[PDB]
């Protein structure tokens, strides 16, 4: 019950042997003395400090702090896939692997001919193809750092919190050297300069051209890649498609007949079925559908058989539901669009 | 005057909230009934 | 202008110089209310495009 | 008591860890804004007698832009690495400040320590974010960006040209920016950046291939001749891209069909050529 | 209906809201709508955003007279020139 | 005498207040007497940061009254007013709209008050009430049970009369909203109310939640280079991601309704976010005389 | 408007030759200049 | 103090406690000088007029 907490503060500068600037988080500057013992080769100006409340001086200093909300998007993640879980689209995994990993390991390859390699890549393509299962994937396999954000959770009323949480999240990532920042559904905020706007607007501009800023602005990064996802890229600004910014951009299509027949084998293992099934029927009605649908037939050949209280499937199911699901597709708009 | 945000059980405890300071932990006053106070609702509370 | 020594003001409607004349300036010749302590004055504008 | 002068912001670019070292060589083609922003930052601290006998006023203020990726921030890098006096640099969107009055706090005192300094350079890179055409007077967020809008203005037109403090001023887009900014006495000169169109581009490509092996039979020309009106920042992108291709297979040194499917890679453009209107 | 149009988005909302909250403090009484016309014809939404504020206002409105233990004990009445414009979801009865 | 001591300093008027950081902490490497303090050195344990309501931020260097083991970043403690110890871990807080649409007095029916709809009731039922009563029949099969559905018609149907049924049989926690109650007028308060909802159905088994009018919000993005709504856009992209994305959950039920299906935006009517999309007719001649 | 444009040019090109007065060439010369960046837009 | 010295829109000392004044200060502020500032007309006359 005897104590008391310390006010914090930030040092400025060490103007003599016994007087310091500093700033409180809070408002006031102030002048204050220091404790005889504490190493003052180590009151660099820019520091954290805890400065006694009775009299103000300084007590002890502290390393950079972390924003609960940078270290909630540090390290939560069911991150258990296997890239045996994706199925069709191998090609992709290879072209990205060769830039966010091949270069954190092997760093000697490259300065032998010559090159820099890229920064970042996006990912595009229609809904449901599995944008995210890949990162997801990544995640799961590789141990280097990982921030994960949704790019929507970080907006908020007051003035200037919004650019205040970039500068801060691209500090932490500076920090801890080898990092990934992925960020999620980009055009909720990417999108374009407008000619007029209005004022509720204009705060996002200003954090957008910050990002921007940050990302290759007068300042060089170094073992910090980043990876972003869109689901529809017509729609992004003529600067964050830049080559300097954004290296790759990678497609992500509608499954080749080979591909469904790949995709398909996997939903289909653990089901209880009986040892009578043509997979190559399915393939061939299933012209055009996404990777998110063979689950939803994987799963209706079940529930016809969970009333009829079979415990088994058997092949007329995958029949009903092909069909059941192929005709409710009509509604959907079924444009590809692309990055331009 | 406040706005309440909730109650706790078994003891009354409340959470008091005012419109520039802080949130409060605080109680009743003897000559007000515990029965009246639904969550939610603007209250006036002392100065001390 | 200077030579017959007006206060020669110009106006673009622009949003600067808008606070000066009124808090919100829904509508326009609040400038009146303006130009009339300083009433020798010449009202000057331009059209590009 | 007094202080000896104290500040904060961007402290001073502190010369030793912080020059980002770009020669002037590593800028290829780009001599005429090269030579003319030399004359009007750099010459100006010298021979400033010639300006006085001549009487052709000496400028004051730069603004530079153009279209993205072509660039600018790297004139900003070549001068911070070959200056002599004083250089700052600060980002346009971190004067904003949550508590009341901070900005222009943050904007006075950047200035005043500039000026005490010595003959320093102020640098504001893409300024879009403070200076814009429209406003709204009744969201407050507006009402701070005015302050600073205004007393920036104030205080740039209160020198007396005779402390030597210049100011380098970056943009993206030109269009949404108020006039009242670019008035003359504040910002005197517009320099504009545009794209490679014969000349610039086989420079770029000669100085940007000098650190691959790239074979030796390599033809070029062919390269240089096509017409796709690229920017600057994709020459760039070809030469880095062809070079991860040749290390993908273990061959250490870049072949003729590598810039192919590079420049394949990089242009994607399909036909837009709509034909039976011609 | 034109006092239902406001400055900044999600307004008009609010106010439908805290106007039949008003209502239902007391016993129960009437409102009148005059010149509706004007805050809501129909849903047409197509290439960029028409009308879409005002139609958000048309939506709380309906939604206040219907589902989930409705107002009980308050009575509508209202009027308009050209009817014709009127959404169908909104003359369907259990509403007028 | 001890705990009576203990129990005369803790009068209730604490302050609340949120911990910023929990840090390891290590001796100096030199020591003193006849001047040593009992918390630079001679301290080995944890130590927290805390920010206060009214915006000040404090060091601690002893915990206090709770076990530094239950804390993280973000919890919400109540504080002491003048030493600035804490005092104990009050419950999590959710927004004062939120408490607000949960019933509490149910709806009373029964399925028998609905002619004309025996195959939709059915598709219903099925996938919501089996997979919260009958886990082992999905289990043995081998399969994952469909997530959410989709219910659209032309006005005069039962659309909303089903749901006030299926609320008044379940015995689930049940959540009633509506579209156009997700717009806000501050840029970023709606966000927060989408995932405060989401984040108090979860802290409940079995939860459903009922998104009236969706196509308030749902309505299809589009290229603009003038201006435009992105702010409800903004909001959207929030939906969708709650509802499958990062970190999928499996606790909470979703139904939504709506009378146009031509608007929404693909995104939203994927297969994985609305599983069963079911539709309504205009009843037959036989159930007209069922309903009267 | 261009005059003004000329005079205010023809200085420069003293200046980069480093001489105190103007002489002809330097106006023709600034002339031309005017003239060839007005032919584009 | 006479109150006819006491002009609108002046700065003026204030006593701590009863709030009292005590003095007068001399900075004024108006708006023209303002909005004239940020506009910055360029003044001439007759002379360098041609044709
Ligand atoms: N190649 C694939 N192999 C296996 N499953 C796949 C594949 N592609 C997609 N899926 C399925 O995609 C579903 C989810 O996809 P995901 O969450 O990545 O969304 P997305 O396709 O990126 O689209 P969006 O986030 O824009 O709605 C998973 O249930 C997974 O079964
Ligand atoms: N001579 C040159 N002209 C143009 N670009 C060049 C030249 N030499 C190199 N580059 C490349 O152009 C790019 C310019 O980078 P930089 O970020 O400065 O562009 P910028 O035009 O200022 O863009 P932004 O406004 O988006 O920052 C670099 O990636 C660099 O490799
Ligand atoms: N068997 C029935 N089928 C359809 N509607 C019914 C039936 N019985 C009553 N109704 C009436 O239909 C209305 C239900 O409203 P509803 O149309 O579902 O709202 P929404 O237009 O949002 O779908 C109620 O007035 C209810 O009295
Ligand atoms: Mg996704
Ligand atoms: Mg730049
Ligand atoms: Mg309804």
Same mark, same amino acid.
């Given at each position: 019950?005897?104590?008391?907490?310390?006010?914090?503060?930030?040092?400025?500068?060490?103007?003599?042997?016994?007087?310091?600037?500093?700033?409180?988080?809070?408002?006031?500057?102030?002048?204050?003395?220091?404790?005889?013992?504490?190493?003052?080769?180590?009151?660099?100006?820019?520091?954290?400090?805890?400065?006694?409340?009775?009299?103000?001086?300084?007590?002890?200093?502290?390393?950079?702090?972390?924003?609960?909300?940078?270290?909630?998007?540090?390290?939560?993640?069911? *991150?258990?896939?296997?890239?045996?879980?994706?199925?069709?689209?191998?090609?992709?995994?290879?072209?990205?692997?060769?830039?966010?990993?091949?270069?954190?390991?092997?760093?000697?390859?490259?300065?032998?001919?010559?090159?820099?390699?890229?920064?970042?890549?996006?990912?595009?393509?229609?809904?449901?193809?599995?944008?995210?299962?890949?990162?997801?994937?990544?995640?799961?396999?590789?141990?280097?750092?990982?921030?994960?954000?949704?790019?929507?959770?970080?907006?908020?009323?007051?003035?200037?919190?919004?650019?205040?949480?970039?500068?801060?999240?691209?500090?932490?990532?500076?920090?801890?050297?080898?990092?990934?920042?992925?960020?999620?559904?980009?055009?909720?905020?990417?999108?374009?300069?407008?000619?007029?706007?209005?004022?509720?607007?204009?705060?996002?501009?200003?954090?957008?051209?910050?990002?921007?800023?940050?990302?290759?602005?007068?300042?060089?990064?170094?073992?910090?890649?980043?990876?972003?996802?869109?689901?529809?890229?017509?729609?992004?600004?003529?600067?964050?498609?830049?080559?300097?910014?954004?290296?790759?951009?990678?497609?992500?299509?509608?499954?080749?007949?080979?591909?469904?027949?790949?995709?398909?084998?996997?939903?289909?293992?653990?089901?209880?079925?009986?040892?009578?099934?043509?997979?190559?029927?399915?393939?061939?009605?299933?012209?055009?559908?996404?990777?998110?649908?063979?689950?939803?037939?994987?799963?209706?050949? *079940?529930?016809?058989?969970?009333?009829?209280?079979?415990?088994?499937?058997?092949?007329?199911?995958?029949?009903?539901?092909?069909?059941?699901?192929?005709?409710?597709?009509?509604?959907?708009?079924?444009?590809?669009?692309?990055?331009? | 005057?406040?706005?309440?945000?909730?109650?706790?059980?078994?003891?009354?405890?409340?959470?008091?909230?005012?419109?520039?300071?802080?949130?409060?932990?605080?109680?009743?006053?003897?000559?007000?009934?515990?029965?009246?106070?639904?969550?939610?609702?603007?209250?006036?509370?002392?100065?001390? | 202008?200077?030579?017959?020594?007006?206060?020669?003001?110009?106006?673009?409607?622009?949003?600067?110089?808008?606070?000066?004349?009124?808090?919100?300036?829904?509508?326009?010749?609040?400038?009146?209310?303006?130009?009339?302590?300083?009433?020798?004055?010449?009202?000057?504008?331009?059209?590009?495009? | 008591?007094?202080?000896?002068?104290?500040?904060?912001?961007?402290?001073?670019?502190?010369?030793?860890?912080?020059?980002?070292?770009?020669?002037?060589?590593?800028?290829?083609?780009?001599?005429?804004?090269?030579?003319?922003?030399?004359?009007?930052?750099?010459?100006?601290?010298?021979?400033?007698?010639?300006?006085?006998?001549?009487?052709?006023?000496?400028?004051?203020?730069?603004? #530079?832009?153009?279209?993205?990726?072509?660039?600018?921030?790297?004139?900003?890098?070549?001068?911070?690495?070959?200056?002599?006096?004083?250089?700052?640099?600060?980002?346009?969107?971190?004067?904003?400040?949550?508590?009341?009055?901070?900005?222009?706090?943050?904007?006075?005192?950047?200035?005043?320590?500039?000026?005490?300094?010595?003959?320093?350079?102020?640098?504001?890179?893409?300024?879009?974010?403070?200076?814009?055409?429209?406003?709204?007077?009744?969201?407050?967020?507006?009402?701070?960006?005015?302050?600073?809008?205004?007393?920036?203005?104030?205080?740039?037109?209160?020198?007396? /040209?005779?402390?030597?403090?210049?100011?380098? #001023?970056?943009?993206?887009?030109?269009?949404?920016?108020?006039?009242?900014?670019?008035?003359?006495?504040?910002?005197?000169?517009?320099?504009?950046?545009?794209?490679?169109?014969?000349?610039?581009?086989?420079?770029?490509?000669?100085?940007?291939?000098?650190?691959?092996?790239?074979?030796?039979?390599?033809?070029?020309?062919?390269?240089?001749?096509?017409?796709?009106?690229?920017?600057?920042?994709?020459?760039?992108?070809?030469? /880095?891209?062809?070079?991860?291709?040749?290390?993908?297979?273990?061959?250490?040194?870049?072949?003729?069909?590598?810039?192919?499917?590079?420049?394949?890679?990089?242009?994607?453009?399909?036909?837009?050529?709509?034909?039976?209107?011609? | 209906?034109?006092?239902?149009?406001?400055?900044?988005?999600?307004?008009?909302?609010? #106010?439908?809201?805290?106007?039949?909250?008003?209502?239902?403090?007391?016993?129960?009484?009437?409102?009148?709508?005059?010149?509706?016309?004007?805050?809501?014809?129909?849903?047409?939404?197509?290439?960029?955003?028409?009308?879409?504020?005002?139609?958000?206002?048309?939506?709380?409105?309906?939604?206040?007279?219907?589902?989930?233990?409705?107002?009980?004990?308050?009575?509508?009445?209202?009027?308009?020139?050209?009817?014709?414009?009127?959404?169908?979801?909104?003359?369907?009865?259990?509403?007028? | 005498?001890?705990?009576?001591?203990?129990?005369?300093?803790?009068?209730?008027?604490?302050?609340?207040?949120?911990?910023?950081?929990?840090?390891?902490?290590?001796?100096?490497?030199?020591?003193?007497?006849?001047?040593?303090?009992?918390?630079?050195?001679?301290?080995?344990?944890?130590?927290?940061?805390?920010?206060?309501?009214?915006?000040?931020?404090?060091?601690?260097?002893?915990?206090?009254?709770?076990?530094?083991?239950?804390?993280?970043?973000?919890?919400?403690?109540?504080?002491?007013?003048?030493?600035?110890?804490?005092?104990?871990?009050?419950?999590?807080?959710?927004?004062?709209?939120?408490?607000?649409?949960?019933?509490?007095?149910?709806?009373?029916?029964?399925?028998?008050?609905?002619?004309?709809?025996?195959?939709?009731?059915?598709?219903?039922?099925?996938?919501?009430?089996?997979?919260?009563?009958?886990?082992?029949?999905?289990?043995?099969?081998?399969?994952?049970?469909?997530?959410?559905?989709?219910?659209?018609?032309?006005?005069?149907?039962?659309?909303?009369?089903?749901?006030?049924?299926?609320?008044?049989?379940?015995?689930?926690?049940?959540?009633?909203?509506?579209?156009?109650?997700?717009? /806000?007028?501050?840029?970023?308060?709606?966000?927060?109310?989408?995932?405060?909802?989401?984040?108090?159905?979860?802290?409940?088994?079995?939860?459903?939640?009922?998104?009236?009018?969706?196509?308030?919000?749902?309505?299809?993005?589009?290229?603009?280079?003038?201006?435009?709504?992105?702010?409800?856009?903004?909001?959207?992209?929030?939906?969708?991601?709650?509802?499958?994305?990062?970190?999928?959950?499996?606790?909470?039920?979703?139904?939504?309704?709506?009378?146009?299906?031509?608007?929404?935006?693909?995104?939203?009517?994927?297969?994985?976010?609305?599983?069963?999309?079911?539709?309504?007719?205009?009843?037959?001649?036989?159930?007209?005389?069922?309903?009267? | 408007?261009?005059?003004?444009?000329?005079?205010?040019?023809?200085?420069?090109?003293?200046?980069?030759?480093?001489?105190?007065?103007?002489?002809?060439?330097?106006?023709?010369?600034?002339?031309?200049?005017? #003239?060839?960046?007005?032919?584009?837009? | 103090?006479?109150?006819?010295?006491?002009?609108?829109?002046?700065?003026?000392?204030?006593?701590?406690?009863?709030?009292?004044?005590?003095?007068?200060?001399?900075?004024?502020?108006?708006?023209?000088?303002?909005?004239?500032?940020?506009?910055?007309?360029?003044?001439?006359?007759?002379?360098?007029?041609?044709?």
């Amino acid at each position: 019950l005897q104590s008391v907490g310390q006010i914090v503060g930030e040092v400025l500068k060490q103007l003599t042997e016994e007087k310091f600037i500093v700033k409180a988080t809070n408002g006031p500057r102030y002048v204050v003395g220091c404790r005889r013992q504490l190493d003052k080769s180590k009151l660099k100006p820019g520091t954290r400090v805890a400065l006694d409340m009775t009299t103000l001086t300084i007590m002890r200093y502290l390393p950079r702090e972390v924003d609960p909300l940078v270290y909630n998007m540090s390290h939560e993640d069911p *991150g258990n896939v296997s890239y045996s879980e994706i199925g069709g689209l191998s090609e992709q995994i290879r072209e990205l692997r060769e830039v966010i990993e091949l270069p954190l390991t092997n760093p000697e390859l490259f300065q032998r001919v010559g090159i820099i390699p890229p920064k970042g890549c996006l990912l595009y393509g229609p809904p449901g193809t599995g944008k995210t299962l890949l990162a997801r994937a990544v995640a799961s396999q590789l141990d280097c750092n990982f921030l994960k954000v949704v790019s929507s959770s970080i907006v908020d009323k007051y003035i200037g919190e919004s650019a205040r949480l970039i500068r801060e999240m691209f500090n932490y990532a500076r920090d801890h050297q080898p990092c990934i920042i992925f960020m999620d559904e980009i055009d909720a905020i990417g999108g374009r300069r407008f000619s007029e706007g209005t004022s509720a607007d204009r705060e996002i501009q200003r954090t957008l051209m910050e990002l921007l800023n940050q990302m290759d602005g007068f300042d060089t990064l170094h073992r910090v890649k980043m990876i972003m996802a869109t689901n529809r890229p017509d729609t992004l600004d003529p600067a964050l498609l830049r080559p300097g910014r954004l290296d790759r951009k990678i497609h992500i299509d509608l499954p080749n007949e080979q591909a469904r027949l790949d995709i398909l084998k996997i939903h289909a293992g653990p089901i209880t079925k009986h040892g009578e099934i043509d997979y190559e029927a399915i393939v061939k009605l299933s012209d055009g559908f996404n990777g998110a649908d063979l689950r939803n037939v994987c799963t209706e050949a *079940g529930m016809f058989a969970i009333r009829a209280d079979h415990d088994f499937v058997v092949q007329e199911d995958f029949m009903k539901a092909v069909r059941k699901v192929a005709d409710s597709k009509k509604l959907e708009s079924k444009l590809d669009y692309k990055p331009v | 005057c406040t706005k309440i945000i909730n109650a706790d059980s078994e003891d009354p405890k409340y959470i008091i909230n005012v419109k520039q300071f802080a949130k409060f932990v605080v109680d009743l006053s003897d000559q007000v009934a515990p029965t009246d106070i639904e969550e939610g609702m603007r209250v006036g509370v002392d100065r001390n | 202008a200077h030579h017959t020594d007006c206060t020669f003001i110009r106006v673009s409607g622009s949003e600067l110089v808008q606070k000066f004349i009124g808090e919100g300036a829904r509508m326009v010749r609040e400038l009146f209310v303006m130009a009339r302590e300083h009433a020798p004055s010449i009202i000057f504008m331009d059209e590009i495009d | 008591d007094v202080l000896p002068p104290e500040a904060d912001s961007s402290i001073m670019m502190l010369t030793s860890d912080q020059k980002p070292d770009v020669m002037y060589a590593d800028i290829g083609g780009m001599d005429i804004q090269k030579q003319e922003v030399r004359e009007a930052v750099e010459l100006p601290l010298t021979h400033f007698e010639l300006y006085k006998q001549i009487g052709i006023d000496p400028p004051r203020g730069v603004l #530079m832009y153009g279209p993205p990726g072509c660039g600018k921030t790297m004139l900003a890098k070549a001068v911070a690495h070959h200056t002599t006096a004083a250089f700052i640099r600060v980002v346009g969107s971190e004067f904003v400040q949550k508590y009341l009055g901070e900005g222009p706090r943050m904007v006075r005192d950047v200035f005043r320590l500039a000026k005490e300094n010595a003959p320093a350079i102020i640098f504001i890179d893409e300024i879009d974010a403070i200076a814009t055409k429209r406003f709204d007077a009744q969201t407050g967020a507006d009402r701070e960006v005015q302050r600073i809008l205004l007393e920036l203005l104030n205080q740039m037109d209160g020198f007396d /040209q005779n402390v030597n403090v210049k100011v380098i #001023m970056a943009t993206n887009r030109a269009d949404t920016l108020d006039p009242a900014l670019l008035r003359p006495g504040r910002l005197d000169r517009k320099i504009e950046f545009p794209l490679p169109d014969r000349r610039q581009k086989r420079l770029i490509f000669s100085t940007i291939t000098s650190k691959m092996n790239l074979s030796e039979e390599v033809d070029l020309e062919d390269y240089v001749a096509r017409p796709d009106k690229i920017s600057g920042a994709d020459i760039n992108s070809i030469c /880095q891209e062809s070079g991860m291709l040749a290390v993908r297979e273990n061959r250490y040194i870049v072949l003729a069909k590598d810039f192919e499917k590079a420049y394949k890679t990089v242009i994607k453009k399909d036909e837009q050529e709509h034909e039976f209107y011609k | 209906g034109s006092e239902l149009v406001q400055k900044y988005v999600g307004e008009g909302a609010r #106010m439908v809201r805290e106007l039949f909250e008003m209502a239902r403090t007391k016993k129960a009484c009437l409102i009148f709508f005059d010149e509706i016309d004007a805050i809501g014809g129909a849903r047409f939404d197509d290439g960029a955003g028409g009308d879409n504020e005002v139609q958000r206002t048309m939506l709380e409105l309906i939604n206040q007279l219907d589902g989930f233990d409705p107002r009980g004990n308050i009575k509508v009445l209202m009027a308009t020139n050209r009817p014709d414009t009127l959404d169908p979801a909104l003359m369907r009865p259990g509403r007028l | 005498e001890n705990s009576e001591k203990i129990k005369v300093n803790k009068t209730l008027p604490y302050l609340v207040s949120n911990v910023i950081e929990l840090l390891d902490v290590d001796p100096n490497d030199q020591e003193e007497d006849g001047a040593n303090i009992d918390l630079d050195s001679q301290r080995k344990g944890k130590c927290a940061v805390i920010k206060t309501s009214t915006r000040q931020t404090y060091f601690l260097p002893v915990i206090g009254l709770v076990d530094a083991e239950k804390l993280k970043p973000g919890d919400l403690v109540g504080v002491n007013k003048d030493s600035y110890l804490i005092l104990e871990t009050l419950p999590t807080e959710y927004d004062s709209r939120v408490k607000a649409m949960e019933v509490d007095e149910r709806p009373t029916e029964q399925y028998s008050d609905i002619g004309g709809l025996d195959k939709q009731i059915q598709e219903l039922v099925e996938a919501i009430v089996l997979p919260m009563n009958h886990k082992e029949k999905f289990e043995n099969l081998g399969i994952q049970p469909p997530k959410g559905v989709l219910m659209y018609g032309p006005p005069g149907t039962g659309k909303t009369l089903l749901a006030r049924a299926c609320a008044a049989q379940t015995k689930a926690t049940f959540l009633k909203l509506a579209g156009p109650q997700l717009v /806000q007028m501050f840029i970023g308060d709606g966000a927060k109310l989408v995932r405060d909802a989401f984040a108090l159905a979860k802290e409940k088994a079995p939860s459903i939640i009922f998104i009236d009018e969706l196509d308030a919000i749902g309505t299809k993005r589009f290229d603009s280079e003038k201006a435009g709504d992105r702010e409800v856009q903004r909001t959207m992209l929030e939906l969708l991601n709650q509802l499958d994305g990062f970190q999928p959950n499996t606790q909470v039920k979703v139904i939504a309704a709506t009378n146009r299906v031509d608007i929404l935006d693909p995104a939203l009517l994927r297969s994985g976010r609305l599983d069963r999309k079911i539709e309504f007719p205009m009843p037959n001649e036989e159930a007209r005389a069922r309903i009267m | 408007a261009e005059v003004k444009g000329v005079c205010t040019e023809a200085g420069m090109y003293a200046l980069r030759e480093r001489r105190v007065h103007v002489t002809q060439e330097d106006f023709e010369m600034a002339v031309a200049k005017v #003239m060839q960046k007005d032919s584009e837009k | 103090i006479d109150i006819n010295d006491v002009t609108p829109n002046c700065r003026v000392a204030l006593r701590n406690d009863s709030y009292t004044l005590h003095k007068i200060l001399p900075n004024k502020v108006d708006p023209l000088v303002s909005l004239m500032m940020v506009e910055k007309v360029p003044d001439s006359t007759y002379e360098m007029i041609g044709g």
